[PDB]
Design a protein around this ligand. Structure first.
Ligand SMILES: OC[C@H]1O[C@@H](O)[C@H](O)[C@@H](O)[C@@H]1O
Length: 465
């Protein structure tokens, strides 16, 4: 019908506003570096907070002993327990338990949340355990990974800046999250001391360098997105005090808050933000991260349903319901290669509650996913490139000459389980780099990286008991 061109008009503006020509990506990468410097001198209201992590020395390998970690993410939390054995034996025993965070605890009271966590820890610690031992008369020490922006005050203390993703708990901003976790643990009451507080990007970069000494930065691409890297302490103007022996400092960029007029946004992006739980915050992250991609697709699919009767002559009711299309569902449809888009069709039936779908409609749906997933992955690649620019690792020496080896640790369901996203990410990154510098850059999955990473940092910062 003539619908067909009204539908093409919509898809045309999507392609047009989501366009990321590499020329635009280089400009975005330059913008990201400018913001990393604005954040490092603590310019007022800089988008990138560039938070000093108090981690001046990353894991070496010569850590030994029994140490726990608590890993609080946007969707789940883990209770980890490792037994380290030096540079030779490394991780001798590992035990972990992962729990999904009940949705109400992302938006209730802080006591409700930390009591829920602490109680899962208390009962996990009692499953210990013949393989892990702690000298007699000692306290167990814990690494705390906190996947939200924290203004740090010591390796083990820090204030909450704001929540992100789907969390919004009153009365917790400004408070010390380790103190909040410790009272929960005494209400439990377990004798445990938190010796390291780290963001999940900072923890992933620790866990990553424990296995590969070439890790210079870690990027999370999961339910949220953020990045951390190793900066030279003498490159941080906002720094006060003695610099560290090592001369380095791991910076939590908090790059989801990146905003820039160069970012290719659309009305679907403004609508998502206007109805988000944190309006105006984390602009960049809402173009990239797993909490948001599926909802961008739903909002594009809904305009087509209405302006092009794409799914019938009445709009399916479920398609008007926010967050009904998650990002894993998007990923399942996007990877269907059956001649008639049979699986993508089955998902649309469940998600929209229709009985059947056209086959033109499924190709448009699949094209809508491709437009959304690829603007997110190309932009994430521009960010990684910016980090490399800031490390002077977008260039290759010079004479020629030994090339460096620079590893990036990645974690998150987007990078780990969304295959076209990861591919587009790495091809764009390689293409921003050059066949040359590219050969020196490694991108690794650093699974469950944040927790052992926190556990290891909690160790090098023990009270020796
Ligand atoms: O979950 C990964 C990232 O998501 C961001 O929204 C959080 O604010 C970061 O602290 C975290 O590193």
């Amino acid at each position: 019908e003539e619908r067909r061109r009204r539908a093409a008009a919509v898809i045309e503006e999507v392609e047009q506003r989501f366009s990321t020509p590499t020329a635009l990506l280089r400009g975005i990468a330059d913008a990201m570096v400018e913001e990393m410097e604005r954040g490092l001198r603590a310019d007022p209201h800089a988008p990138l907070k560039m938070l000093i992590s108090y981690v001046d020395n990353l894991p070496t390998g010569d850590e030994h002993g029994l140490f726990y970690a608590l890993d609080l993410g946007g969707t789940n939390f883990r209770v980890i327990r490792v037994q380290l054995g030096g540079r030779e034996k490394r991780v001798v025993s590992q035990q972990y338990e992962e729990v999904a965070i009940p949705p109400h605890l992302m938006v209730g009271t802080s006591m409700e949340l930390f009591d829920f966590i602490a109680a899962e820890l208390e009962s996990f610690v009692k499953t210990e355990g013949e393989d892990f031992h702690l000298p007699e008369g000692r306290q167990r020490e814990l690494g705390f990974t906190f996947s939200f922006p924290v203004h740090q005050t010591s390796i083990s203390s820090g204030t909450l800046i704001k929540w992100t993703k789907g969390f919004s708990i009153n009365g917790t901003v400004g408070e010390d999250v380790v103190a909040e976790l410790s009272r929960a643990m005494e209400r439990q009451g377990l004798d445990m001391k938190v010796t390291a507080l780290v963001n999940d990007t900072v923890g992933t970069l620790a866990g990553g360098r424990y296995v590969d000494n070439d890790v210079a930065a870690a990027v999370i691409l999961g339910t949220g997105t953020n990045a951390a890297y190793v900066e030279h302490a003498n490159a941080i103007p906002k720094w006060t005090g003695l610099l560290p022996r090592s001369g380095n400092m791991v910076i939590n960029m908090e790059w989801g808050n990146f905003k820039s007029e160069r970012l290719p946004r659309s009305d679907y992006d403004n609508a998502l933000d206007f109805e988000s739980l944190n309006p105006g915050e984390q602009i960049y992250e809402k173009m990239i991260s797993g909490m948001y991609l599926g909802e961008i697709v739903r909002r594009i699919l809904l305009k087509l349903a209405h302006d092009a009767s794409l799914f019938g002559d009445v709009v399916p009711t479920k398609l008007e319901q926010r967050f009904i299309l998650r990002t894993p569902d998007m990923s399942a449809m996007h990877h269907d290669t059956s001649h008639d888009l049979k699986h993508l069709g089955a998902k649309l039936k469940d998600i929209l509650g229709v009985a059947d779908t056209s086959l033109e409609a499924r190709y448009i749906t699949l094209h809508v996913c491709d437009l959304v997933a690829e603007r997110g992955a190309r932009l994430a690649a521009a960010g990684i490139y910016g980090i490399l620019k800031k490390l002077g690792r977008d260039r290759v020496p010079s004479d020629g000459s030994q090339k460096q080896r620079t590893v990036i640790a990645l974690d998150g369901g987007l990078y780990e389980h969304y295959k076209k996203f990861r591919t587009c990410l790495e091809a764009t990154l390689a293409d921003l780099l050059g066949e040359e510098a590219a050969s020196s850059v490694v991108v690794k999955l650093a699974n469950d990286g944040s927790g052992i990473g926190a556990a290891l940092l909690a160790a090098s910062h023990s009270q020796y008991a």
